[PDB]
Design a protein around this ligand. Structure first.
Ligand SMILES: *[C@@H]1O[C@H](CO[C@@H]2O[C@@H](C)[C@@H](O)[C@@H](O)[C@@H]2O)[C@@H](O[C@@H]2O[C@H](CO)[C@@H](O[C@@H]3O[C@H](CO)[C@@H](O)[C@H](O)[C@@H]3O)[C@H](O)[C@H]2NC(C)=O)[C@H](O)[C@H]1NC(C)=O
Ligand SMILES: *[C@@H]1O[C@H](CO[C@@H]2O[C@@H](C)[C@@H](O)[C@@H](O)[C@@H]2O)[C@@H](O[C@@H]2O[C@H](CO)[C@@H](O)[C@H](O)[C@H]2NC(C)=O)[C@H](O)[C@H]1NC(C)=O
Lengths: 4, 218
C-alpha cells in the first residue's frame, strides 16, 4: 500500500 | 493519472492544486469559498505555512490569469491513521474566500452514509504522474473508473479500470473522485505500484465524513  | 485523458479546460472548477515552492504535490477539492478538502497524508509533517492552494488552474506549465492563490489558515483533521491508511481526509481553511466564477466553483457532496454499488462509473482526476513514460501532468487529467468491492474494505471507496492498466498515481492524492455528479472519494493510496491492473485504487469515503465536513464549513 502506497499513499499517492 | 495513468492512462487517462486531458480534461476540458475548467471542466472541473472545484479541482485544486496544492503546491510547495511552485510545485504541485497533491490535489484538493473546493468545498466552500474558504475551505478545501484533501488527503490528510498530503500534509503529514508538512509545514502548512509553505503550502499554496491554487484554484482555477488547468495547465500547470502555463501562466493562467484564471488562477486564485490562497494560504492555509487552519487545518481540521479526523483521525488519520498512517499504519492502516484510514481517515485519509483533511480540511484546510483558507486565508480568505475564493471568488466563485466559471473557473472556480464549490463541489457538491453526497448525503451522509451514501454507499456506492459495484459497477458505479466515476471519474478520477488530477495532476499526478502519467507514468514513468512521462512525468507529472501539465494539463489536468481525468479517467473513467469503476467502483469495486473485491480487494476493498468498507473504510474505502475502491476503483478499477477494466481491460487495461490505468489508475491514479503519485501527485493525484487528495484529488476528487466524482460519482453521479457528487464527490464520493478523495484519492488516497494505490497497491503494487500505479496502474497495476490488479489492485483497486483506494479513496477516502467522503460520504462517511459528511456530518464532520458540514460541522466545519457551516
Ligand atoms: C466515462 O465517464 C463519463 C462521465 O462520467 C459521468 O459524469 C461524471 C462527472 C461523473 O458524475 C460520473 O459518475 C458519470 O458517469 C460518462 O459520460 C456519461 O455518459 C452517459 C451515458 O452515455 C451520459 O448519459 C446519457 O445522456 C444522454 C444525453 O446526453 C441521455 O440521452 C441518456 O438517457 C443518458 O442519460 C452522460 O451524459 C455522460 N455524462 C457526462 C458528464 O459526460 C461515460 O459514459 C463514461 N464511460 C464509460 C464507458 O464508463
Ligand atoms: C492569502 O494568501 C495569499 C497567498 O499568499 C502567498 O502564499 C503563502 C503560502 C505565503 O507564501 C505568502 O507569503 C504568499 O504571499 C495572498 O496573496 C498574496 O497577496 C500579497 C499581498 O496582497 C501579494 O503581494 C501577492 O501577490 C499574493 N501572492 C500570491 C501568490 O497570489 C492573499 O493576499 C492573502 N489574502 C488575504 C490575507 O486576505
Amino acid at each position: 500500500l502506497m499513499x499517492x | 493519472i495513468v492512462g487517462g485523458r486531458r480534461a476540458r479546460p475548467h471542466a472541473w472548477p472545484f479541482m485544486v492544486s496544492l503546491q510547495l515552492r511552485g510545485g504541485h504535490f497533491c490535489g484538493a477539492t473546493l468545498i466552500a469559498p474558504n475551505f478545501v478538502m484533501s488527503a490528510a497524508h498530503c500534509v503529514a509533517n508538512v509545514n502548512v505555512r509553505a503550502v499554496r492552494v491554487v484554484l482555477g488552474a488547468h495547465n500547470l506549465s502555463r501562466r493562467e490569469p484564471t488562477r486564485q492563490v490562497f494560504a492555509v489558515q487552519r487545518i481540521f483533521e479526523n483521525g488519520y491513521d498512517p499504519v492502516n491508511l484510514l481517515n485519509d481526509i483533511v480540511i484546510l481553511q483558507l486565508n480568505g474566500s475564493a471568488t466563485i466564477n466559471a473557473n472556480v466553483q464549490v463541489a457538491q457532496l453526497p448525503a451522509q452514509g451514501r454507499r456506492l454499488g459495484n459497477g458505479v462509473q466515476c471519474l478520477a482526476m488530477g495532476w499526478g504522474l502519467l507514468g514513468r513514460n512521462r512525468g507529472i501532468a501539465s494539463v489536468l487529467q481525468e479517467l473513467n473508473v469503476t467502483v469495486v468491492t473485491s480487494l476493498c474494505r468498507r473504510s474505502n471507496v475502491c476503483t478499477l479500470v477494466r481491460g487495461r492498466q490505468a489508475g491514479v498515481c503519485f501527485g493525484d492524492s487528495g484529488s476528487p473522485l466524482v460519482c453521479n455528479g457528487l464527490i464520493h472519494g478523495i484519492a488516497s493510496f494505490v497497491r503494487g505500484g500505479c496502474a497495476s491492473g490488479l489492485y483497486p485504487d483506494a479513496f477516502a469515503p467522503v460520504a462517511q465524513f459528511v456530518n464532520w465536513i458540514d460541522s466545519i464549513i457551516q
